[PDB]
């Protein structure tokens, strides 16, 4: 570009309109361990 080369593969603009449905996932701070006494 401005006297600098940034090598990158061929960009595929089709990746923009990619169907990505959001899936449920909950994190529980405070849960269960592997072993208990």
């Amino acid at each position: 570009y401005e006297d600098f080369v940034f090598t990158t593969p061929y960009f595929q603009p089709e990746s923009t309109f990619k169907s990505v449905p959001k899936l449920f996932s909950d994190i529980l701070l405070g849960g269960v361990e592997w072993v208990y006494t």
Binding site: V20, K22, L23, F24, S25, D26, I27, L29
Partner: protein
């Protein structure tokens, strides 16, 4: 950017990093600490960081910026507003360029294609 009033708390928690902060909803209890009279609509209290902003204006209108605004109910609103927009700007940027860091993203733990299993 959040295009709603509500956001899932887990969607802004880290999956492969310790969670030392949350992105909580606006603290409505701070609105009842203002001793003076004011008009506030419920349709503006859920959107992020705005309730703290309106409260700051109400406090800057009733009081000024010198020796009367310096009371605990009004300074906490100014601090919450200054702090809410800083965290939300950082979480928003981290969501834009580091979506794989958060829970709910499919890239946090990529699920392999069937061709990678060797069956």
């Amino acid at each position: 950017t959040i295009f709603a009033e509500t956001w899932e708390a887990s969607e802004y928690q880290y999956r492969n990093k310790a969670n030392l902060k949350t992105l909580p909803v606006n603290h409505l209890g701070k609105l009842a600490e203002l001793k003076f009279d004011f008009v506030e609509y419920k349709a503006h209290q859920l959107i992020a960081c705005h309730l703290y902003e309106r409260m700051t204006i109400h406090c800057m209108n009733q009081y000024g910026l010198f020796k009367d605004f310096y009371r605990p109910e009004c300074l906490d609103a100014q601090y919450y507003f200054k702090t809410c927009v800083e965290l939300n700007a950082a979480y928003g940027i981290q969501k834009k360029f580091f979506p794989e860091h958060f829970v709910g993203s499919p890239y946090a733990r990529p699920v392999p294609q069937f061709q990678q299993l060797g069956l």
